[PDB]
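#dry-run=false #mode=assembly
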Amino acid sequence: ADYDLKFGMNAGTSSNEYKAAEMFAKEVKEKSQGKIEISLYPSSQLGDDRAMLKQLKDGSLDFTFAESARFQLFYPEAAVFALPYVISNYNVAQKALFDTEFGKDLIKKMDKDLGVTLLSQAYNGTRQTTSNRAINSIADMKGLKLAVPNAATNLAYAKYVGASPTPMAFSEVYLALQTNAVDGQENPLAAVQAQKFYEVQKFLAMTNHILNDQLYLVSNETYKELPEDLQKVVKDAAENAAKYHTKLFVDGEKDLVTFFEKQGVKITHPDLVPFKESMKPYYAEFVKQTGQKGESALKQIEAINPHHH
Ligand SMILES: CC(=O)N[C@H]1[C@H]([C@H](O)[C@H](O)CO)O[C@](O)(C(=O)O)C[C@@H]1O
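#status=ok
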C-alpha cells in the first residue's frame, strides 16, 4: 500500500485490544480507499509498551497503545492515574485526561516531548487479583508473591497491601503462575480471560484496585506525512474503535465472573476498607516525591464527580 503502517501491542490475538485494533485497521483501509493498510504486531513481538513508545518517538512504529498512567515514566505526577483507589471509575478517567488542566497539559507534552499524538481514549478494565490460594481479607495478601508489570504504581499496590511483588513482562506471567514461581497476578478480568490465566489460577478476588484506560497513539513522524483527509480518516477511525473497545470491556465485566466460575475459579469479595486504608502512606509518599505538581493533579482529579451527568 501507499502507507504500509504497523500497530504494536502487548495484548494477544484473543484480546479486546486486538479486536478493537482490527476494527480500526479495517475502517482505515476502507475509508482511505486502500491507501493505508495497518498490520498488527501483538504479544509484545516488538517489545513491551515502553519499547513501543520509543519506536513511535523514533518513527519506526506507527501506532501503539498506552495507559495515561504509563506517562509517569516521564512526568512523575502522572502516576495519579494509577495510585490505587484514587480514580473512581472510567467517567473520572475520561474527565481527568481531557477536562483538567493537568490532563490537557499532559496531552500537549506527549506531542512536544515524546513524539506522539493522542487519537482517542478507551476503557481497558479495572484490575483484580487472582491467586493460587483464597484472598478472603487483606491478611491473605501478606507474603503473597504477586506478578506485576514493570510499573511503579503496581509495585506499590503490592507493597502497601503487604504482598511481595515480582515485576515482569506480560509475556512471562502465564509461565510464572503455572510453575508457582509466583502465587498470583493483578490484571483486569478481560486479560485473565485473554491470557487464560484462569487455567493456572484457582481464585479471583475483587480488589478493584487500579482503573486502566487505553490510549490510541500515533507517531508524529507518521501522522505528519498523511494528507489531512487521511489524518481525518485515522482520527475518526480511532474514535470509533475506542467506543467499541470500551463496550467490549464494559460488557465483559458483567459477564466474566460467571465465565470464570464455570471454569472452576472461586471468587472472593474481601472487605476493601483495609485495602484503601493501606494506601494512605503511599499517597503521602507520592505527594512528597512529586511536590506541588502532584498535589495539584490529585486535587484536580479528586474534584471530578464520578456520576455521569
Ligand atoms: C497498554 C499496555 O501495554 N498495557 C499493559 C499493562 C501496562 O504495561 C501496565 O499496566 C503499566 O502501564 O500491563 C499489563 O497489564 C501487564 O503486564 O500486567 C498488560 C497490558 O497489556
